[PDB]
């Protein structure tokens, strides 16, 4: 899985005075870069899907739909981030994008259910993000990751929790009318 | 069951002159108290279920929204009751709140059932209630009662008759796809 | 007083794997069950004074207008923290609710600094759940409780204590004309 | 600089029980008092710099306005933290306000970065306020200076920066026209 | 009191050619930097007594508006001598604003009696500026002071003296309901 | 260089029977998958460099917008390709995406050459796939490139001659004044 080896990279990868800076360690900064990278890589994964589920031999819309927003909302999620790097008065330094592990998908539920595993790994990283900040005494970093991303992490993974389990009771994979009721009535 | 320990207490657990007070019997008193107690419990057993249909392994909005609005109704009809206590002339006196007996429910059929069985059971004791009232010769505590209780309850319990039925006849509860539709169309 | 009773119980007492559970201990899931008995516990206490204010020898209205509305705060609040409950992946737990420990009040002055009283209990159990919570190392806990409870709390005993002086200062409870006029114009 | 010596002074000297008051050290009552007294300079030091700008033989009327604008935002804030000290219950203790050190500026650049200067010293106040307070369990505290005071900061801080650059890149100093150009068109 | 202590200092301390100077003598600009010296004295005063009106034992709103409103109304006061200052091609000269000598005030009939006092001390030195001004033939400096000035000094000064009786008759300060009424419906 | 690193790879790299294919050979689906690879890469070179601008010690608000809106631009550009091999029958296979060369450029001037060279090369990439199109006799797809993006090169390449002729004649790298208003007048 690609997720963990871009984990266990050192944070000297991910290092490139200014006259803003103040009360800003370098670890925090090359931990910033790397959840840029990660940002970057869940958008990509997001498209895949998205153009996977509008084959002609797939056919389901509202998935394609679905998946195409997620993607987008990923991009503004590390634009975001960048800005921050800029304001605080880092360096950006960035990286490859690796191509996602999965290729096809076979059915809705498979694709939801790694869609909650990806969201898993993103909350992970940052909560370990928000302790590193935490023990080096950086107030403003805290409140900045409190305020504009842990709540979203957490509806994110309960809605694909109970989109997960609707479709499970419904029959699926093997009923493709669960599925196509599931992809009128819910994404309608 | 919790009903019918609150029913077999006696009038004097439930009394705590006036100068509007007339024609009003104090037994009359016990019964208005008591009878708000009762509706306080069905309210917070209404609560309890609509949040259990909150769950992430259960995932069924439309019945959530349906017993928090079931909630707040049986919350209004209690505080007109104290309203109508203080009219008259007499004394409200509170009692505990037992929790409620059920703590699951497995499906929204078993809750529905649920739901009927409460209903008919508080119908049972306005009737009582009315019979004290009317051999006791108080022709507006009688006259209350029939115009804001007795056809709402009819009402209900043939709402509940309906839904019951429907999700019987549509194969529940071993086909999911069967609450499924009934959430989306009946309650939606 | 029933308040320090609830607040002595253990925790085990208010417990009943799920697959949106994460970094979320059992510890946390006890005591938000607690606060929630608490609230509701809270919201009772306020209707009872409520509907005390409106008897034929008080007959003070804005006085029952106001607590009413404290009441229906105290219940929303409640609703929201089972809520949380739900999204981060526990289980709910219910208890009795017990009556009030006060009958009457005799006085705007008597009402106005028991629910000061209160409203200060209330603050404290905030208080020691958000220590229990920063222990833990579970920053999105901890920002929920500082953005929805903490600065409304402060504020409300800022208005209570206001109330209180100004009802002192007039002359109460001595003066029911001070009552009256506090009525009218403050409350109004 | 006015601004060590202010910082340097003992808490003791910024002291002058409440019914409101719960969890609310001294320490954090006098450090209250001192970043009034900060906030209160600052302002004082903007007006003075606002007022150099309109004498005949500088006239450049956009720098003047900024800083006016400036000054009253700082009075703002001052009136805000007076407004919590008096929330928690504490004791409003003032002292005298010191006159700004430099009396003329010589160019837009020398006053740019003056207030670069000047911002960063607010900032650095703030940063040991938030430590005194965290370190004492004050939630509340710690959460409206969070809130209300950081990111305000590292805003101003970042365009000023911008500001300084800008006109170091056209040639000021020493071209009139440069400074003429950047208030006409950035601060227009 | 601080005010004649700023009030005997030598005009030699309120001082610091140009193209637009013209019949302009320099003890004009030495009273005048005085003036804003005092004015800003003034505002200071105001803030003070209009924050020590919200704590939680006074609890009088209005008194704190309407003395909020006066201290900005100095503040604009000071300002516009600024622009005079430096319309006519003086130099501007900026001394440390003293403590308000006062700290309690008690009452409002208390502070209403200190406002009117201070009101006069402000009259007073307006007029011997303005015998300054005519006994050096400066017409300009004599119209600005008569058309900005004067007639605001004795409204206030009536105003406040109606405020005084009003309070003095209605009981006050022994008796807390005549500052009561008088807050809601003079102030309100 | 990664352009013609990109280039040089055969076109078995970019491949991983349908029932609405007809006329679409398969040197056809790898080329276009070539090209998507091609825009995404283009894309992430436009966000870094706008990204630079956007630093305290460079400072031009309009350069970083534009260069944004570039960016978004060459994003559209790769999904319609992306929606054109689903129409046509083809399977979409994706490749990482490389950094890009430069990670500093030091001035506009600079940065606008680059991106003027990186234009030049995706159009003579499009240019080669329209001839592979027209030796293989598929009309459809040649109509596709010639419709939507051979025009659009040819007026991208244009304006940005333009904006280096200009920046050119004005004095830049030398003069930051010219810096300055260029991106206060042409891409303001």
Redesign the interface.
């Known amino acids: 899985n690609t997720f963990e080896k871009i984990r266990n990279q050192p944070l000297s990868n991910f290092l490139?005075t200014?006259?803003?800076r103040?009360?800003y360690h370098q670890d925090s900064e090359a931990a910033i870069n790397r959840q840029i990278n990660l940002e970057l890589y869940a958008s990509?994964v997001y498209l895949?899907m998205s153009?996977?589920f509008?084959?002609?031999?797939v056919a389901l819309k509202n998935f394609a739909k679905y998946f195409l927003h997620q993607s987008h909302e990923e991009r503004e999620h590390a634009e975001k981030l960048?800005?921050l790097q800029?304001?605080?008065?880092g360096r950006?330094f960035?990286?490859?994008?690796?191509?996602?592990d999965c290729?096809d998908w076979e059915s809705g539920l498979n694709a939801m259910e790694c869609a909650?595993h990806l969201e898993?790994n993103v909350?992970?990283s940052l909560?370990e993000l928000?302790?590193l900040a935490?023990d080096k005494?950086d107030?403003?970093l805290?409140?900045?990751?409190?305020?504009h991303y842990?709540?979203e992490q957490?509806?994110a993974?309960?809605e694909l929790?109970?989109h997960?389990?609707?479709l499970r009771?419904?029959?699926a994979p093997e009923s493709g009318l669960?599925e196509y009721?599931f992809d009128k009535?819910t994404l309608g």
Chains 1, 2, 3, 4, 5, 6 share one sequence.
């Open positions: 490139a200014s006259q803003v103040q009360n990509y895949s153009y996977y509008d084959r002609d031999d960048m800005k800029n304001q605080r008065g950006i960035l990286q490859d994008i690796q191509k996602p290729d909650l898993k909350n992970q909560l928000h302790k935490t005494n107030p403003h805290c409140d900045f990751i409190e305020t842990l709540n957490v509806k993974i309960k929790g109970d997960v389990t609707n009771k419904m029959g669960a009721l009535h």
